[PDB]
Structures are given as C-alpha cells and as structure tokens.
C-alpha cells in the first residue's frame, strides 16, 4: 500500500484478500465437486533503460541510472541515483581529431524520483558533464564537472541533512604509454550545508601512482609497472605513489553513493577499495581511534566480550610509498617503503613501514632472508601481552631465514627461523600488527620465479590450529577439505623443520599420496608480561591423505596428529588425532542382482589440557549401504542404509544469522551422545517407498538419560514413512 | 460466456525419482479424469469452505457475496458508457483418486479413499472406503507348478479417513491386512485372511 | 497464417502431484549430519530432509529438525541437547490475559519485565511446558495447478 | 502444426437469453394437477 516495494508489518497477505486463490483455508468451491480459483495476470519487467539513436550521439532514458565519472567524483554505478537521462557523444570518426577518440558524456536526473518529505532525495537534482581524449597509446586524459542541489521546493520541505548544493570538478589521467603505466586524479569539492547562512566547506583530493591496474579496477602490485633489462640483469618497479586526501572528503563531497573510509582498519588500513559496495578509490580517509567513556565512571567502556569501545574521528591522509626489486641471475633482492599521516601533516598520526628481502637459489637448493618494521604512532587496536585489548602506539621488528630443498620426485624439505620483537620485547606473536600495511612483500621458494609478491610468508611451514568441523570427527570424512594444507596465518617466534610430499606433481614417487610432518619450538616468555624467556613451547604434527581405486572400489583414507604443551591461537594444549576411511563401489555385473556397496568410518580423540580442568573428547562415525539395482521383478530395485554417531564431550553450535555456518567443537559438558538409525528405500517402476526410524540419546555420566526432554528416562525418537510418485502431463 | 479446452489432457506419465538410486522415467501411463475450463461467473450454489469438511455449514460466506460482480442481480460491477465487468475464474473437478502402477503379476494402487473387500464378515469396506493408503495385488496365474490353481495375494495399508480432528473417530487410527487365495477344483475358491 | 496464430497462442501446462506421508517424533532433531558428504561438500540426498539451505544467513540442512511437519531449528546449550535437538521452552502466564515465551530449561531463571506480574494459578506457578512431540497424520495429497 | 495448435486452444461459447414474462395472483396455488398424464407417469409440459 505504501509503494516502497517491501512487505511492511500489517500489510495483508495475497491469499488473505482473494479467498480461494490458494492455501488450505477458504477453499471456494461448489457442491457436485466443482472448485473455483481466480485467474491473475503475472508479469515482471527487467528492462528500465531505453537507448535511442546510433553513433555518434546515443541518448538513454531510464529509471535508475548508473554512471561513473571517476574514482572520487560522481561514481554511482552500483545502484544508481534516480530518474533522468544520459547522453554520450563519441567522436572517433571525424577528420582532424579522429585519431584521439574524443568522447563527451552528459547526465541529468532527480534523486530517487518520487520521495517522501522525510527522505534525503526529496526535490534534489544532479547534473554533470565529462570530456575525454586518448592522445598517445592507452593514456587517457579527461576533465569533468558535477553538481547536485535542492530546488525551491526541496529547500523548504526536505527536513533532512542533505546539503543545499555540492559542486565538484576535477581531472584524471589513466593509461599506459611508452611501456610505463601511470594513474593520477585530482578533485575539488565545495559543500554548502543546509543550515541558514552557513559557510562553504572546501575539500580536495589528489593522488598519483605508477602501478598496474586490472579490468576489475583494483591495483595489482605484483606485476611491474616499469621494467628495465632482462631476466639476467633486470630492475623492476612495482609501485610509486603520492596521495593527499582531505579530512572532509566523503561520498557527499564527491556526489557518490558510498564514502571513502578504510575498507578494514586491521588489514590494508590505507586502502579504500571496497568490493562489497563497489568503491574503486585507491586511498582512504583515515580514522584516529581513542577510548570511550560514556557513563563517565573513570574507566574506558568495553563491550560484553571484553573488546574495547572506540570513537572514530576523521583525519585525512598524506604520504608516499615505493616498492622495487632487482634480479641478478640466481640472486634476487627486494624492498619497500611507505609512510602516512593526517592531512594536516601532524606527526601524531604517523605510521611508517619499511623492509627488504633477499634470495639465492641454485639447482634444487634455496635460501631467503627478510626484515620488517612498523612504527605506528597512530593509535591502533591490538591485544597486549597479558591478553587485554588496548589502543595505542605499536612498534614491530621481524626477521626470518628460511632454507629449502627439493631432492626430486614429490619430496620437499624446509627449515626456518623466525623472530618477532614488538614494543622492544620478544613476543610469541606479532598480534596482527604487521598486517596494517599494504606494501609488505616476500619472495617464493623455487628457481626462476623471482616475483616480489605482496604479503608476508608467515603461513609457510606452519602447523594448523583448526578447531571447527562439519563432519563430526574432525574433518577426516570430508572429501572437500585437505587436512595437510591447513596452516595458521599468525606470525610466531619459532624455529623448526618440515618434510612432506605432493602426489599431484607430474613427477612423484607415489601417485595421489599427500602427507607432511613437522616439529617446531615456539617462544614463551617466563611470565605473561615478562621480558626474558626461552623456546619452551613444542609442537609435533603430521597429516596424510591417499586416494586410490582398487578394482571397482574407490578407497580414500586420511589422518592427522598433534601434540603441544602450549596454547596456540584457539587450540588448547594436549595431544589430538583423527583417522577416516571412505569406500564406494560401482555395481558388480558378475554377481546376482547388481549390488553396489558404500561405507565409511571415522575416529577422533583429543586430550585437552585446558586450565579449567583436563578433559577428554571422543567421536565415532560409521555408515553402510547396499543397493540392489535389479531385484526379483524386472523393474524393481531396493536399498538399505545404516548410520551412527557416538560422541563424548562434544557439541554443535548452530548457524549464526550473520552468515557464519555451524560447526562441531569440544566442550566439557560431561555428556555422551548416541545418534543412529536405519533408512530403507525401495522402488517399483517409478513408485518409491521410503522408510526411516532414528533414535537420539544424550545421557551424562553415571547414566541419567535426557533425550526426551520430559525427564522420563527415555531417548528421543522419530519415524517416517513416505510414498512418492512423480507424474508429468 | 465460457471457455472450454479440448480433451487431450486426460493422460499422465511417470517420472524419475529416488534418493539412494535413480529410476528410469516414463515407465507407466495413467488415465485421469480432469474436466477444467475457464468460467466468467460463479453459480448461486457456490460457497467458501473454511473448515475443510467439504460442506456448506451455517455462517460460511456465499460465493457471490465475496466476489462482487460475479453474478446475481445485486452488486453489478459496471462502468458508465455501458461496460460491464465480471471476474474470470478457473473451474476444475477431478473424478480420479487412484493411481495403479505396474503390470501383471504385481499391481500397486495408491489412492485417497481405498475400497477393498476381504470377506462378508471381515474387513469389508467396499462401499465408501476407509482412508489414505496403498493396495498391492499379486496374481500367480502364470507359474510352472501352481499355475492351474490361480493363487492370489492381496495387501492393504492405510490411515483411517486421512487427516482428522482430535474429536473424530479416525484420528491416529491405522489398518493393515493380507489375504491368500487358491482355486483348486472347479469354481471352488478357498482363502484365508488377516486384519 | 499458422505462424501468426502461434504468436498469439497460449501454451496450457497443467500440473498434478500425488504422494503419501506419515511422520511421528517424540522430540524433533536433525539427522542430516549422519549422511555421507559428497566431494563438493554437500550431504547426500534423502527423503526425510526438511532442510533450508541459505548461503546468505549461513543456514544449512543440518541446522533444522526433520521428523515432524515443522522445521524446528536446533538449539545450542543444555536446553537443546547441545545443538543436537530442538530446545525446551516454557510459556509465561501473566496477569491481565497476556503471555510470553521463555526459551530456557529452568523456569527459576526468568526475569520478570517491569510492569507485569505472573499469575500463579495458571500452570506451574505461571509457567506452562511447551510439548515437543510433532505429528503428521497419514494422508495422501493430490494437488492440481 | 495445426494439431498441436488445436490441442492448446479454447472453444469460446457465448450464450444469450431473451424473453418477457408477467404474472399476477391473489393466492398462489398449483395447476399441474389439471394437465394430462403421459404413459410413463409424468404430467404434460406447460409454460407455467
Ligand atoms: Ca510496504
Ligand atoms: Ca527526488
Ligand atoms: Ca524513491
Ligand atoms: Ca563504483
Ligand atoms: Ca565506563
Ligand atoms: Ca464447511
Ligand atoms: Ca478425514
Ligand atoms: Ca487418520
Ligand atoms: Ca535437517
């Protein structure tokens, strides 16, 4: 009724207004068996634009116009703005300037068309125009002008926070010329607030990069922008940029849909590229965070889970960066640098990161070095040594040395040594502080691949810290999960060694066999907040996986192992192991009927040395099924299926409404579960009979059944019989 | 005015189905009795059945009283310049409720009010039926050793009256049975049954 | 002439459904967690799955009961057998003809909202147990569209 | 092609009625008992 296109509360349902149009209630009928149903006309139009004319001039009239001038100016190609028209003039065919490919765009529209008096788009209109040429190579230059304001009716009844008018103009230069890719953009804005006799606010943005850009409109930073020499003696530049974003620049000042804040405040803090909201701006409008004290008790407010509550103020951004590399035959080196601060240039928001690398690789051997640095004077949210979340300065220094060898076949061996020193003291973990930058880079093992790819290699040769699974036995019965490829991404302070095998390679000792084994020692300080310490931690892990086809049976088995005396990530101390097996067979043509079998079995044990008290968790899952593809009658087949699951000190957390799936996990609830049943299905011609009975019981120790929920000592139960028959006219 | 279609839509064919296995489709053709067509108005006998009992109880609204302009003399939905509007309805009536699948020997029937008859004093429900279920019939006329005795086995399962209220006699009531039969000499037919 | 006639023609496509179903359960719980997992990560199909897969909210077929005619979601904690079955709940009988639902296991842990008082006469001190059994009476359904 | 078109076709059958009638009575009584009885036992048809 209100025209918003959504079902609000109280609006009548479709079947409630037209009785007899569906459902079980209110069947409009007639004695002698007649049944009447109203006839409706259903339609749905997916077209809203109407382009008229042919080249050069094309004019489009639409209902939600999508357009895009530049990154920081007048970018509304995600959902659109409102009702209007768009004109495009292309001058590719013209005598004098036909080689430069001129192009002119024009935009007019009204925000959201009809709007209520309390909506932001009541009596608000926009307009713009952009010119463009492509003089040399791919290098494209252009200028544009944008405008949006209130009319005489909007200025008096809009009752919202939309500014009186916004005027924006700028220029850009994107393309690749003379073997060098260059991107730049300048933009100036003037916003007049809706309040009476208010001053005009001026805010401008500017940046200039030398880097590669994808058709996705996101910068690659892994392919060089400008090179020199060849693979033997080569020097390549990956990035070189300068930026200056004003504090008052946002979506309103740019006449866009979504603002230019940081996509995340923990990873790539300086980057505003948001795939979800379709923001293609390369640089962000930074935030300075601080403690919050609402009730004013003298203590900073914290959430229910212990996370701090922070207040965000908008500072600009102004800094420069660089990233290069150099190949010298076998030896390869790299490096990066990046600094940032507020738009005003104050040193109280400075964050500087720098580092380097090295590599030598002859024949099968390899050797790598690394160094990293963070000097964020800007307040950042991270956990302290004890484990309490804080806000403040952060300094990180990391260096790692990694050796490798590939003696042929699928074999590989690798040893490493890593060291992290946060805030002047040795630490077990860097607490995620090294991820705030966006230029950190490292090499990759091998010979001939000297690419300086972004991202620290903190997840190489590490163990796994997983705790959640969906099959119920730790992931050994899940064909879609590789247990040997699970590696934690946190940067530890450890040294170890790992040996493995990869059966997917063309040359491999055993085909379709994957396994690994390792041993690392983690650094643990004397106390929680002490300075001294030693590598007291110890981890020993091993994984396996083997897929094969023997005869008609496809056999797959997996395994895992772990044993630690320290807590890592969310995984507690103590040993842990799990094994599995899945068998599937094709129908046997040589025996009476045509039976094909199925089966699976899994076991999972875990001794948890948690502080609250040591407990043990168990799991056991099995299955079996026989399908007789040819029963006594010519077109009859039958099948049976038996399943079971025995758990102990395990639980299942259902799905979160935000989008996170459920999982199984250990819990010291002191309860033993036992869920099993049978499933019999048989078909005659195309008529299918389905039967199934199941039973779930959950009794704690000393034997007190809780299945029924009424405390009568009986388990839960279920049964279902179904006859199915599908017909087509 | 009324719209009537042809009678080509009087036969259906089976389709593939199953979970542990997939069956071959188009294995059986079933004859059905559908009489459907578009109508421009409602008769005065129509009503709105809210309780699902299939009868016009007291208080249930009439068909023409809910859809104004669909019939009668009162409440004519018109337009000046003489235009008169009447809603268009879809009328149908199915006289088929059973679906027999398979051929000899074994025939299985799935229906909505199953009619069956074991003997005079036992399990005789061939007048109006009992409820929702299935019936299987096995005929052993063609078989090497006992083909001359014409053996026959019947099977019956169902839920009495299907869905019922808590106060009706058929709420949560299920029946089952089986009967064997031979014809050794002449017309003399002997048999046993269970219910 | 035939081409013009086919342009202004309606393709009549009637539909028909048939099938029988009966289901009984003392308490509604999920059984999709017992079936084998395919290589792509989806559980094997079965005839007793009232599972609503929703990638937007993270819902899966293992998060809902399958034994009644209702898709009762499982409940975490001791109230719902630790995520394995539908959770216990109570109804609260307030004075002046109003009721509220308490979604826990122990009725001695309910907070009374300000401005309301429970009626001790109705139920057990104003708390009525919500039955957990689900029944689908045996019936065959013929649907014509 | 024509056979398929006729399968998915609707047979339009409009109807039309026409007639005049007037009737008066001091008291409503029956007159079907005055008409002859056929051999099958049914009275002869009449317009009233
Ligand atoms: Ca609405
Ligand atoms: Ca508007
Ligand atoms: Ca609108
Ligand atoms: Ca965009
Ligand atoms: Ca406080
Ligand atoms: Ca009724
Ligand atoms: Ca009934
Ligand atoms: Ca019944
Ligand atoms: Ca389910």
Numbering used by the authors:
A (entry chain C): 439 to 1167
B (entry chain A): 390 to 584
C (entry chain C): 245 to 389
D (entry chain A): 245 to 292
What sentences appear in the manuscript?
We have solved the atomic structure of a highly abundant protein, SlpA, and discovered that it forms extended structures that link the outer membrane (OM) to the peptidoglycan (PG). Our results indicate that SlpA cannot fully tile the OM and that it is not a fundamental component of the S-layer, but that it connects the OM to the PG layer by forming extended homotrimers. Deletion of slpA leads to substantial disruption of the D. radiodurans cell envelope, suggesting its important role in the maintenance of cell envelope integrity.
We performed single-particle analysis on this cryo-EM data to solve a global 3.3-Å resolution structure of SlpA, with the best resolution in the β-barrel of 2.9 Å at the core. The structure showed that SlpA forms a homotrimer of 30-antiparallel–stranded β-barrels (30 β-strands per SlpA monomer). The SlpA β-barrel is the first structurally characterized 30-stranded barrel and one of the largest single-chain β-barrels observed. This insertion appears to be stabilized by a canonical bacterial SLP metal ion–binding site coordinated by residues D274, D276, and D310. The coiled coil consists of a highly conserved, prominent salt bridge between E232 and R227.
